[PDB]
């Protein structure tokens, strides 16, 4: 990479297809999850807050408590265990 900022190489993953453009529906930004629930991490291009480091887009973690309204999701990066602070807006129930 020519630079090493967080958004380096995120032109594709952090951009919406033209039709999904514009404010996202509030239903999923308010979803409630329970500890132990498996959730997929996927940043919503339209939702600025509650994000996580793009590197983790695509991970399926395990909700384990929350911090403020944001949730704390455990994931494993390669072989390393990590806790990710993310809001519902960027989460989806597995299955």
């Amino acid at each position: 990479p020519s630079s090493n900022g967080p958004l380096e190489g995120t032109r594709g993953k952090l951009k919406n297809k033209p039709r999904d453009r514009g404010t996202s529906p509030p239903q999923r930004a308010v979803e409630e999850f329970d500890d132990g629930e498996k959730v997929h991490l996927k940043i919503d291009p339209s939702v600025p807050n509650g994000r996580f480091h793009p590197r983790f887009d695509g991970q399926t973690g395990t909700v384990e408590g929350k911090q403020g309204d944001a949730y704390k999701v455990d994931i494993v990066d390669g072989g390393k265990e990590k806790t990710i602070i993310v809001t519902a807006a960027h989460l989806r129930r597995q299955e």
Partner: protein, 186 residues
């Protein structure tokens, strides 16, 4: 509409019915919404919760089913609103609902407005709702005193036939009084 790249607003935004930015700030509380709505002739008051396939209404009250308790006056005024609020408030209570936030939809937060009236009523029904006392009307206007005095400048009945000639904010009291004990559907 124009092409593949075109962006169509969500349905309730095309219809100019739902303000989605506000809806989100509303759902934040995690509490049930006290949906205050109006019509030229009527005034609605619903207590909505969030659901898997859309909102769920646990309790409602419409200015029309007000007469079902002895209302013999118009149904698009302040006294009407308040009561409809108190009516929904009570039903709400019956449903096991204890608190809610005021959703006034696409209306304006004007002081002494009917939505705040709906809110005053709902609160008096025993429902806990974040509010601000001095943004509400001064009880008398809620009774419908502003209208009685307006008919004082008579010369011609404010009410075409309807009931009374000088109107009755008392009829308001008699009704509130009624709703505060027993009766069916409450």
């Amino acid at each position: 509409a124009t092409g593949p790249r075109y962006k169509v607003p969500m349905r309730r935004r095309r219809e100019a019915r739902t303000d989605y930015h506000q809806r989100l700030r509303l759902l934040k509380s995690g509490k049930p919404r006290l949906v205050a709505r109006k019509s030229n002739k009527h005034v609605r008051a619903q207590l909505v919760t969030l659901g898997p396939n859309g909102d769920d209404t646990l309790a409602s009250a419409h200015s029309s089913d007000l007469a079902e308790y002895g209302w013999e006056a118009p149904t698009g005024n302040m006294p009407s609103a308040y009561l409809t609020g108190l009516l929904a408030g009570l039903r709400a209570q019956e449903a096991g609902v204890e608190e809610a936030v005021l959703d006034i939809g696409l209306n304006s937060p004007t002081p002494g407005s009917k939505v705040f009236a709906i809110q005053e009523g709902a609160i008096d029904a025993g429902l806990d709702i974040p509010h601000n006392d001095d943004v509400l009307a001064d009880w008398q206007r809620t009774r419908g005193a502003h209208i009685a005095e307006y008919d004082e400048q008579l010369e011609e009945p404010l009410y075409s036939g309807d009931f009374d000639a000088a109107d009755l904010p008392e009829h308001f009291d008699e009704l509130r009084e009624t709703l505060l004990d027993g009766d069916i559907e409450l």
